[PDB]
Design a protein around this ligand. Structure first.
Ligand code: HEM
Length: 153
């Protein structure tokens, strides 16, 4: 798991996100969609977004970024005690949305990138280590639920 110190770093970084949840959310999704266009195909409601300018201009994309990062934030504040929060997420992304675990790796990487981009020189080596551990824990617990369901893609 994560140490007390590590959780404190995680929630300190998260305070930076919370100052502009929609901006961070928008940028996370744009990084994901532009880096991995196959992911855009999982969103019938974002399929019409044919350019990055269109992505930037979409208020609905910002709304969804808000929903996604609010859910992750709730999970992170549980400091690993997140079975109740995580289980329904795991189940909807496997059975309804059909999201391979690879795509959760992609969005985890996108969060790290966006943190550096929005906070250059203010996201230290210790903070990146801690946040990376937290995202891996999140991914690994979802992967366990995916294995239960026999889900691959
Ligand atoms: C940090 C990781 C993620 C979190 C916290 C998250 C959270 C959420 C939440 C809270 C919802 C709405 C409730 C639900 O349907 O369960 C949602 C919907 C959805 N998610 Fe995610 N998600 C994550 C990653 C992803 C990724 C990587 C993809 C695809 C590449 C994805 C695809 C979708 C789709 C297609 C919907 C339904 C969108 C719609 O309203 O049409 N999610 N997600």
């Amino acid at each position: 798991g994560l140490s007390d110190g590590e959780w404190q770093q995680v929630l300190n970084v998260w305070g930076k996100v919370e100052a502009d949840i929609a901006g961070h959310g928008q940028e996370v999704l744009i990084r994901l969609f532009t880096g991995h266009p196959e992911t855009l195909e999982k969103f019938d409601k974002f399929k019409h977004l044919k350019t990055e300018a269109e992505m930037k201009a979409s208020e609905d994309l910002k709304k969804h970024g808000t929903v996604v990062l609010t859910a992750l934030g709730g999970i992170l504040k549980k400091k690993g005690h997140h079975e109740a929060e995580l289980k329904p997420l795991a189940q909807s992304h496997a059975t309804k949305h059909k999201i391979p675990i690879k795509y959760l790796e992609f969005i985890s990487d996108a969060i790290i990138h966006v943190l550096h981009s929005k906070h250059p020189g203010d996201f230290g080596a210790d903070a990146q280590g801690a946040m990376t551990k937290a995202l891996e824990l999140f991914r690994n617990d979802i992967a366990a639920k995916y294995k239960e369901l026999g889900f691959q893609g």
